[PDB]
Design an enzyme around this catalytic site. Structure first.
Site, PDB file in Angstrom:
ATOM      1  N   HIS B 118       0.329  24.560   1.642  1.00 28.04           N
ATOM      2  CA  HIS B 118      -1.047  24.120   1.314  1.00 28.04           C
ATOM      3  C   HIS B 118      -1.961  24.681   2.366  1.00 28.04           C
ATOM      4  CE1 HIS B 118      -4.317  21.040   1.150  1.00 28.04           C
ATOM      5  NE2 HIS B 118      -3.808  20.510   0.038  1.00 28.04           N
ATOM      6  N   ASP B 195       4.787  19.848   7.051  1.00 29.92           N
ATOM      7  CA  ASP B 195       3.739  19.236   6.238  1.00 29.92           C
ATOM      8  C   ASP B 195       4.457  18.344   5.223  1.00 29.92           C
ATOM      9  OD1 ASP B 195       1.937  18.506   4.322  1.00 29.92           O
ATOM     10  OD2 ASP B 195       1.140  20.510   3.975  1.00 29.92           O
ATOM     11  N   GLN B 198       3.368  15.621   0.532  1.00 31.25           N
ATOM     12  CA  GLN B 198       4.135  15.238  -0.648  1.00 31.25           C
ATOM     13  C   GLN B 198       5.495  14.659  -0.299  1.00 31.25           C
ATOM     14  OE1 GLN B 198       3.068  15.359  -3.778  1.00 31.25           O
ATOM     15  NE2 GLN B 198       1.079  16.209  -3.190  1.00 31.25           N
ATOM     16  N   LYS B 221      -2.101   9.483  -0.903  1.00 27.84           N
ATOM     17  CA  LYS B 221      -1.006   9.895  -1.784  1.00 27.84           C
ATOM     18  C   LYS B 221       0.160   8.901  -1.729  1.00 27.84           C
ATOM     19  CE  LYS B 221      -2.408  14.734  -1.747  1.00 27.84           C
ATOM     20  NZ  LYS B 221      -2.055  16.056  -1.123  1.00 27.84           N
ATOM     21  N   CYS B 357      -5.225  23.978  -3.711  1.00 30.01           N
ATOM     22  CA  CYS B 357      -5.242  24.395  -2.330  1.00 30.01           C
ATOM     23  C   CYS B 357      -3.983  25.199  -1.928  1.00 30.01           C
ATOM     24  CB  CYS B 357      -5.289  23.155  -1.411  1.00 30.01           C
ATOM     25  SG  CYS B 357      -6.938  22.426  -1.526  1.00 30.01           S
TER      26      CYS B 357
END
Ligand code: PLP
Ligand code: PLP
Lengths: 399, 399
Positions: B118, B195, B198, B221, B357
């Site tokens: 991302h 990252d 998610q 999220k 993104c």
């Protein structure tokens, strides 16, 4: 548009439980509109489908979309693209230091910072000074405890590039002569960071008439959500700034070879916004717009006066209050502040003591801490009596 | 601890109005606990007095005080002082780039960034590369669309200092072999930015077993507030980092001559926290803890499978989905994505299209955009049928 304190008071669900809440300068209670807009925002999908609450969803979108304009209207900013969302006054000021000043400052340049600044408007300057070989230059107080704007011609040199000055101290409630400071700074080609975290609440700055370069404030003190604040900059200055955080939304195109950015304000707003914070701040602003701030603030200041005049009759009182402010910082001789805070709380009076993130100011005032009672438009004359009666009894228990 | 989708579903007040909500990978709906904790937080004083709702106020404090520990428990972090509050995954990664990497990186050092990242985990590296004369080195995908962790020994050089790798893509839902990547990076003395925006939702990382250096994710999220996220760092790394923003709370002493900082995590948390965000995230975590994530995620993935197998029977379908993910990014030949998003919304199906993104990933996949339906544990088999039926009718109207 006649201000009615009882009407204003009725909007705050916390008030009954809160007792006599005198710590608004640390953070404000919220009106029902901010509570409700936040409850709707989290109780509904942010998606493109609404099978039963389409009305509520369209309201939320309208609050979000009008939110920059509501801040522009509070500051008399000429357009809403001069408004940048941050997580608070602190981030706003660091953004000006890092994105405007750091790329520009040369070894030996000077940043004048007043002795009355909150840490938010001092630490980021000490940091960028270290980073660039620039120097922080002290603006002292005058005998009335305000930054000495008359000293500025003496303290401004060829090397002077930035002035960091608070519109209003969170300790004394004092406001330096900001128009004059900005006149002197601009004659020298300097830019001014105005810390409005308290000023936006009490005397919201007309950034056009004042010719303010950058103005910062926080939502949570302006009856609004935590985790949201504003940076206002003149459009040419926001354009001149480097990007702040990198990520989504602040870019147009991105590849392994580089990226192109949005223009301001989006250039400076990476990643998913604090949507709940923007919508609740918009709700706070829209709610506040129905009140004449001059009448509300004169009411708040009048209560601080009643309290200060009364407290001044008790032995050992000292006040640090300037300009009949709504904020009343004070001390009592022979009293440990934390003891007095605790006893007042048993009487149902909420206030605080401590350093108020203003170490250099306190050092200059010759104290390590102050009590502080701050008054808002949801306070009453009976709150003033309750405070004074509680102090009398605390003194009896402590002294 | 048997997962029951109907029990999980019942907790989300938005669901009735939301229709068939298939955009959880952009942002999640909230359970009633997060709505209620936020409503209490804004409906009560944060002060020291409570005349009638002392119970509710003590709960809020307890949620706030346990909140780092709830994040540590989700990640199996060894202690809560390895958890740093941010406004989101984006800020977390920029903090690692600016506070850990920038002071260390030398001209010519190399930062390996996967093609599946991302923008949040790519833009801050391109920026710090420019700032330090370091270089970003591409980690390509393998033929199954995952970052090619087998390539790493070939791409690691003496100059390699940092690996930025997503635990899970927000497009394909793919997870690279993270244990192996970290083994290779650490043999080279590198540190890894993972990252987890998610990954924390679907397969929350055990940061001890995985030996993760830094892990980032966002509250919104993870069924939680906007404007709040986490940076986890190993304690020695958080200690090694320079301060991030300057201001209150991150300092001990401040004067015109300099300042002393708190230790981590406070060192990295200037100014007033996003208190509503910390309390709501704590509420989201405490609510989530009652569910076995393995069962919940297997349910979500099973719905994506049903949907993908069905959609694969319609002419012109292409899927970008990896590893039977809960996220289903897809395209249909001869269909304008925005048209299909709009028609689906008329059928009560909320999803989205766009670049997500992830420009470099999409370029690599040979597309400009994808539709994406993402499934969560509050979705149902009937949501899958509704999606497929709506697609059939959209195709009829569009193709
Ligand atoms: C959402 C997302 C981000 C960015 O999160 P923000 O909350 O917008 O800062 C970064 N990485 C991935 C994989 C994401 O899905
Ligand atoms: C509160 C306050 C700040 C800092 O605000 P945060 O919301 O904590 O970033 C800065 N200046 C003054 C004068 C303040 O009162």
């Amino acid at each position: 548009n006649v201000f009615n304190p009882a009407q204003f008071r009725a909007q705050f669900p916390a008030l009954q439980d809160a007792g006599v809440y005198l710590d608004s300068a640390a953070t404000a209670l919220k009106p029902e509109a901010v509570v409700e807009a936040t409850q709707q925002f989290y109780s509904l999908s942010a998606g493109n489908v609404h099978r039963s609450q389409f009305a509520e969803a369209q309201r939320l979108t309208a609050r979000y979309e009008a939110a920059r304009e509501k801040v522009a209207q509070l500051l008399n900013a000429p357009d809403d693209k001069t408004i940048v969302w941050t997580r608070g006054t602190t981030e706003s000021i660091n953004m000006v230091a890092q994105c405007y000043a750091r790329p520009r400052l040369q070894p030996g340049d000077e940043i004048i910072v007043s002795v009355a600044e909150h840490h938010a408007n001092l630490v980021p300057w000490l940091m960028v000074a270290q980073q660039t070989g620039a120097k922080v230059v002290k603006l002292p107080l005058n005998a009335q405890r305000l930054p000495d704007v008359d000293l500025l011609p003496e303290l401004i040199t060829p090397r002077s590039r930035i002035l960091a000055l608070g519109q209003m101290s969170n300790v004394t409630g004092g406001c330096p002569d900001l128009a004059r400071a900005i006149t002197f700074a601009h004659s020298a080609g300097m830019v001014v960071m105005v810390d409005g975290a308290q000023g936006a609440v009490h005397f919201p700055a007309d950034v056009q008439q004042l010719d303010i370069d950058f103005y910062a404030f926080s939502g949570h003190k302006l009856y609004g959500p935590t985790g949201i604040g504003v940076l206002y900059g003149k459009s040419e200055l926001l354009e001149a700034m480097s990007p702040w955080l990198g990520g989504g939304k602040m870019v147009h195109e991105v590849s392994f070879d580089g990226f192109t950015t949005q223009s301001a304000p989006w250039k400076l707003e990476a990643g998913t916004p604090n949507v709940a914070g923007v919508i609740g701040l918009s709700a706070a602003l829209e709610w506040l717009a129905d009140y004449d701030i001059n009448q509300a603030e004169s009411w708040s200041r009048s209560l601080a006066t009643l309290a200060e005049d009364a407290l001044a009759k008790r032995p050992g009182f000292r006040s640090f209050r300037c300009q009949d402010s709504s904020l009343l910082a004070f001390d009592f001789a022979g009293v440990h502040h934390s003891d007095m805070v605790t006893l007042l709380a048993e009487y149902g009076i909420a206030l605080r003591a401590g350093q108020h993130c203003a170490q250099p100011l306190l050092a200059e005032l010759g104290v390590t801490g102050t009590l502080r009672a701050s008054f808002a438009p949801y306070n009453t004359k009976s709150d003033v009596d309750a405070l004074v009666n509680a102090v009398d009894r605390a003194l009896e228990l402590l002294v």
